[PDB]
């Protein structure tokens, strides 16, 4: 078994696609925080904000970069980027690195990111490799989920191959050549192969030979009237989904989320809290832990925006905004800012 | 297996049709933006707006181009256009290129778009190829989904082919042909073919006469009354749909969403937030990253309009507008602009 | 297999009928747009508006013409009309052309519509052929959906013929004729068929004949206890529908749209957004791209009217109009214009 | 197969009956129209109105003529009437013609309506044949639906004939009459044909004898206990209905619409918008294209009235009128006109 | 098969009974219409109103006459009455004529109603035969629905006869009198025929004999384990109903109208619009087309009253009348006229 054959499972493909792409769709904002604890969102004039929101490097989009990082984070439990910085020490480029080529080894109290580029060993400090570092016991690396999923994936590909092959044989069931006691010539015996090479493929339908001996031949295989050849296929989707923690109604099972929450907003809230939330924290805290300078901690901060998911329907959002009317929890201008309407006296 | 034989699957055709069409149906606009963050939608006198909205080239419509680009972006994970620009260096044309003929390679620290034109091997810069660059680990190219889907597609076409030819055989099962209990001449053996083999057609009916030397012929097919046959077909639709991430009830299967909101608007939000959104991001971001010049970033901003999907029914939209009329979140003039009614004092 | 035999499938016939006819039923309006951005609907005095709304040519209705164009657009992915224009360059006739006879070939930078009329090659520029050009990768032609549907159609016509001919044979199931050793005379062997031919056809009911050997006969047909011989007949409708993207409850499956939207308006909204919308855009944008002169772009515009579908029931439309009462979103005169009631002081 | 044997299918009869009847039941009116777009319904003193509403010819009713025309338009995709006009050139009669005897051909740039009258071959102009010209690729003639439906109709009539004949033979299965190994005289054969075969009739329950050759007689019918028999009949109703586009619950099948609105008004809207509407368009447009002279276009306008279908129940209509009374969208006099009540001050 | 045997099918009997009787129950009113477009209902002093509402001839009731006409109209697609008139040309009698004896033949431009009275040919003009003329392609006669229904009726009577006979035979299964090879005399063997007949008949339960050769008998009746003998009986009802267009829940199928309309009024509205309406129009328009003199057209008019069907329950009609209270859409006197209550100051 190998990683690409595993990635060819539709369920795996979908999960990885979904998680990475969703977190890549979110707006990411950067803030300067005043001493009275007020946020100001910062502009593309700020070097870090430009690096993040506009361009990570001379080859990529921001969206594209976050997606690419997150794919490795999910697939390998870990993702790595080269960090580049100017003479003032401010970062100026980020560039993803293939996790499969990375090693990280401690060196006395220190750490070295040992990157195997082909047959060359590009060795780096904690100050120039970002390392998003997923779920794992050591706090030094995430556990690579692909490495654990290998057995259930093994079951899934085994069934899929059997299922293919049965229909590829035109459902011509395998036969015992159960026989009798007549002397057969070696050519009579040879006919059993010699006449054929089509009991898998070709339309020798009414015609599959036996010798001048009649014989008693009968089927060997169990037939996919063994209902596992359906039911078991369905069952595997849950097994694979459980490595990623994805609600199976988003994947395709049964129908829809039967007793859990009614409207779309409840589904989104559930999906956020039980699945999407960790990645948000991993990104935001890593940025705070390594990219923001220690003197700017507490002043400078970064957040993903959730409203693109938490968006309810027209009726609910109208009712919500009306509930801000009395109570006065917003001005008309603040509400008009949420949908970029022109400001108005109030 | 090949891409055309795959695209002939109704599911695959429908998925690509749906996504590419829907995003091509959206309105797409550009705003100039003031320093106080007021929008100003720009006119067809602006070259970029004209290019995007009226005409991408002297052969095509805007819609028609966006559609074609998006089809490649889904099918191959990547799409490419040749850019062209005037003596001022401002863009004046876009023309699609075959993702199947394109290659992108790093060449020193630079990159080259190698395009196989027919029997020639053109090379191009990041300066002149637009490259929409979908989902993938490198951040340099997208994973071509057709390449991964090939196995489940292989199963689907295997089942489909087998399923047909059973009825093409007049629904008669494969048979073991024992040559009786005595040897016969090679011509008598040839007459087994003269006697039989046309059992795939209708009219044979009764001339299935056992010759005067015993014989013991019987069936070796399992019958489509096996527990796979029908259910097997249904299952595989989901497998193919998962490569594109489309909710199967939109693909026309079985039963519609019971438990995430019943109203059409909630279906649209679900489809947007979990399927359409990323493509919207990729377009808008690519335009901002490569086509809008750096000096105009934050001044100029391209966006799609969502309202064509987020449209509610008469009752909901009436209630919504009334809830903005009271509270005063809009003037009558703003609301009348949404449905292009003549303005009034307000 | 051939296009007419495919068109004889009820599902295909219905889909093509529905889509083309619905878009042909819609009102199509033309507008002059004032510099203050107010629409004026234009009259049958305008040459283009008359060409469109009243008469495309000396043989046809407007409705009839739009229908005819749209049938080819759906069936072949493409539709073509000869364009005719006066000495002032204004268009004066449109005439549809059979897509199967069309070729389009590039000629250096130029394009030639190569029309094979019988054995003659009527060759035309982009300035005199309209070309509605559907969904496809090149932006130069739409993919012809019939060409892809051919395989699922193949399965469908196979099952249909088997289903017929089983009852055409009165379900007189086919048989082995057997004994083991008696010499049949060549007349006995003749009579084994020559007595009959009505074993397929007529009422030989209680009296198929042996010859003088008793016989030990047995059957070879599977019986339509084969679950496909009902379940598959149902299933294939979805396959065909997926080439056109039609919601199967409009076609005939199960009952009605189970969990999707309650009232008729929600069904119409769904059908518009997920199926009908693209054709609207293709028409409207093609008109804008080729028929309206470049100097009149932005001034002159055309729209289909959706209200004939978006029409809710009496109660909902009454409630809607009442909700315009306060809020004041219409005068009584504007509402009376929606149903052509005489205007009244207000 | 033939058209009458097809029309004898209950489905086909019902579909044609329904559509042609319903559109013939609608009121049809003409408005003269002022330059300020006020309607004025015209009187039976107007020749065109009299022709349309009182009498199409000295043999028929208006309703009766519209019905007959529409039957042909559905059944043959086309319908034709001979026009007649007075010395002023104004129309004074319409008479239907057989679509089965009509042909239309291009003749130079002109067209000829070739009509086979009996054993003669009359020819007519576009000036004197009305030609309602239904759905089809050319825009010159409609596709005759009966021609495409013939295969599924073939399947339906095959089953219907088989179903009869089973009970007509007293529900006794077909048999191989196997006697044994004795040679038979032609009289002994004649007595197999007369002692026996008669069993397929009614009364001979008692005796059916076997001679001293010992016999081996056995059945070859599958029995209608097979899984097709009943469900087969049901399925085919949908197939035929799809050529006409009628919702099967209106055709009296199985179960009524669960999930597009329960109220009768929503059934009517569904049937209108998805089935009836196109015919309404074809009539009104044909009249405006050929019968109303060019100088009167936009002044004179023929229309059907929809209210006979859009009629709500007592509760809904009361609420609706009250919602126009308040708001003031009607006078009492207008509302009293709808149900022809005497007017009052208002 | 014959018309009376067809009429003996309960479904056919019910449909004809229902339609004809319902339209015969309706009030029929005649109106003089003032020039200001006000209706006056006319009295039994008017000759036509008396002929219609009180007495058609010296033998019949009005109800009875309308019923009788409508039965022929449904059954034969056509109904005919002799028209009689005074010296002033005003009609004074109507008398129905058996449609089966009628022929109508054109005579140059003229028409002759050729009535075969026994062996005599009573020949008449359009001025003295009324001819209600139902649904049909020519506008000269209706298609006789009985003539088309003959095949499905054929299936139905085949089942019904078989179903009778099986139980009339005491459900004894018909027997092959199988044996072996022992001799018996022809006189011994003849005792089968001599003795028995009660295998088809009645009381001999036990001593069905054999002649002295031991015997080995077997059955040949399929049994109504053939589910058609139940399920198909049910199915036939729809086939027959479809010739008349009657909603099968009114006839007896399943239970009640499952998803279609809730209260009785919705059922009545549906039944009116989709089934009853055409006959109303046929009557009313025929009266207007032939019985009312041309000078009185527009002045004199006739309508059936629908309120006897459109009658909702006590609660709904109370709520309705209360909704007329404010709004003022009736006076108390007008409402009291609807239920013949004495008028009162208002």
Author numbering:
A (entry chain F), B (entry chain G), C (entry chain H), D (entry chain I), E (entry chain J): 52 to 397
Sentences copied from the publication:
We have determined the portal vertex structure of the bacteriophage HK97 procapsid, where the scaffold is a domain of the major capsid protein. Assembly of this large complex from hundreds of protein subunits requires transient association of an internal scaffolding protein or domain that acts similar to a chaperone and is absent from the mature capsid. The mcp gene 5 encodes a 103-residue N-terminal scaffolding domain (mcpN) and a 281-residue C-terminal domain (mcpC) that exhibits the HK97-fold including a triangular A-domain; a P-domain, composed of a long spine α helix; an adjacent three-stranded β sheet; the flexible E-loop; and the N-arm.
The portal clip domains visible from the exterior exhibit neither strict 12-fold nor 5-fold symmetry, suggesting that the 12 portal subunits adjust to their incongruent fivefold environment. Visualized from the capsid interior, these stripes correspond to ten ~100-Å-long towers that surround the portal and originate from the surrounding capsomers, two towers per hexon. Cross sections along the portal axis showed that the portal/mcp interaction is mediated by mcpN, including some of the surrounding S76 to S88 α helix but primarily by the flexible spacers and coiled coils that adhere to the portal’s 12-fold symmetry. Our model of the portal, despite lacking 50 N-terminal residues that are not visible in the density map, revealed several contacts with the scaffold that occur in a groove between the wing domains of two portal subunits in Fig. 6B. We observed that only one of the three coiled-coil helices interacts in this groove where it is surrounded by a polar distribution of charges: lysines (156, 160, 161, and 346) from one portal subunit and aspartates (94, 135, 141, and 169) from the other.
